[PDB]
């Protein structure tokens, strides 16, 4: 059912967001000793980021940007504008501050319920801005108007922001 899938995805997203915050807090002291102009410290940072990526169910892409680096696991250069921006952090490294952005392209559960159940997913803020979609009739950055559509839908609020996850079936 849509209701069962809405609960599962919200719990999975809330867990994933807690692990990211726990990761950043527990690596605060470690990152301040790593200078990202050194090839060893870049490798050590990539190892920690990729380890974090594969501890979560969702398909996540990180972007660590600064003066000398644009470090990412988006090796195929997929358009991050079509992804859910999930967290943004300014991290203190030995040599400079670095911005860490984590994007969610999908989750295995949302992709499966789209394939097997034709249930699509939207993430919108309190002003109806579309922040995530896996249905091509919706574009991230545009407005969601629920009165324009008649699909069975159920929504739940995400904990990390004033965002709503909407799972629907046409």
């Amino acid at each position: 059912t849509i209701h069962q899938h809405v609960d599962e995805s919200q719990s999975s997203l809330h867990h994933t967001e807690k692990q990211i915050q726990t990761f950043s807090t527990q690596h605060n002291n470690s990152f301040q000793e790593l200078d990202l102009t050194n090839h060893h410290d870049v490798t050590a940072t990539k190892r920690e980021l990729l380890k974090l990526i594969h501890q979560q169910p969702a398909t996540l892409y990180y972007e660590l940007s600064g003066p000398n680096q644009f470090i990412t696991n988006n090796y195929e250069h997929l358009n991050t504008k079509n992804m859910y921006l999930f967290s943004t952090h300014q991290l203190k490294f030995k040599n400079s501050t670095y911005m860490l952005k984590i994007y969610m392209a999908n989750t295995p559960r949302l992709s499966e319920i789209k394939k097997d159940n034709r249930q699509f997913a939207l993430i919108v803020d309190q002003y109806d801005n579309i922040l995530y979609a896996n249905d091509d009739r919706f574009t991230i950055g545009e407005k969601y108007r629920p009165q324009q559509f008649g699909f069975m839908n159920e929504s739940v609020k995400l904990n990390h922001a004033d965002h709503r996850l909407i799972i629907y079936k046409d």
Binding site: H40, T43, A44, K46, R47, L50, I53, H54, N73, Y75, E76, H77
Partner: protein, 294 residues
Amino acid sequence: NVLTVYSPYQSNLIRPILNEFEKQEHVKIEIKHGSTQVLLSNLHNEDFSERGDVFMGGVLSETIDHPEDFVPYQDTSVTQQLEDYRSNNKYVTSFLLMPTVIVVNSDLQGDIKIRGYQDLLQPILKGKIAYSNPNTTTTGYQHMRAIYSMHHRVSDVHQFQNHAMQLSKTSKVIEDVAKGKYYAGLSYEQDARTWKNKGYPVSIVYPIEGTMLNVDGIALVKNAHPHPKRKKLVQYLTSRSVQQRLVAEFDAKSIRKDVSEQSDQSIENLKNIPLIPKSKLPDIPHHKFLEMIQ
């Protein structure tokens, strides 16, 4: 009407050439994908009347446990193929040469030296390397023979298996190494190059102790109503223009002297690959080797 093909190959390698055969001969080709031994075992239990026509991919000349499921055939194109890699198996025609490789994640590697199987046993790599099931896959099985060929020690095979994570699918190894779940993995050349060419941080390593070369084969499947064009397909797959296209568009290594062996960009041709010589290759039959390393 439909010509059904069993193949462990990835679709990206064989679907284009088979599509050209479809247009050339006005026939529909359907592919059944899966691990080599899973396809063979399901073929064995498949009812005689519903079986497909052709099996392509895998080391068929050495890992077909049920020869009664296939029909002998001789490709008229053998005289143009490399003499070291022709089939002595009554049911199999040699098709491609596929080096088995170690894939290394260059984002994770750092200073960890990885040049062969022995380097994979470094304690820092424990639980961070992957391989596919040797009982069901060509790739996992051939790698276990390569590890055994080092010192002819079953302990070396067991030592690696206790050091690595076994996966069910060969292509899951390259995907999870490329995406950063594992530091290294046991794969094969064409799969490794597919993900390296997409931009993933994949380094292809030919084991310094001896690289196992796969002689991929083609076999006709014993069925009630063989497709009338299947022998033409075997000739097509071993034909010069098709082997040349496989080398040019897909960087494969041809079975034929005739095709010009264009090796550059990424990674080696045959001469520069430290292949396991014919004297060090284990001659233990497929099933017996699998039980021995059990």
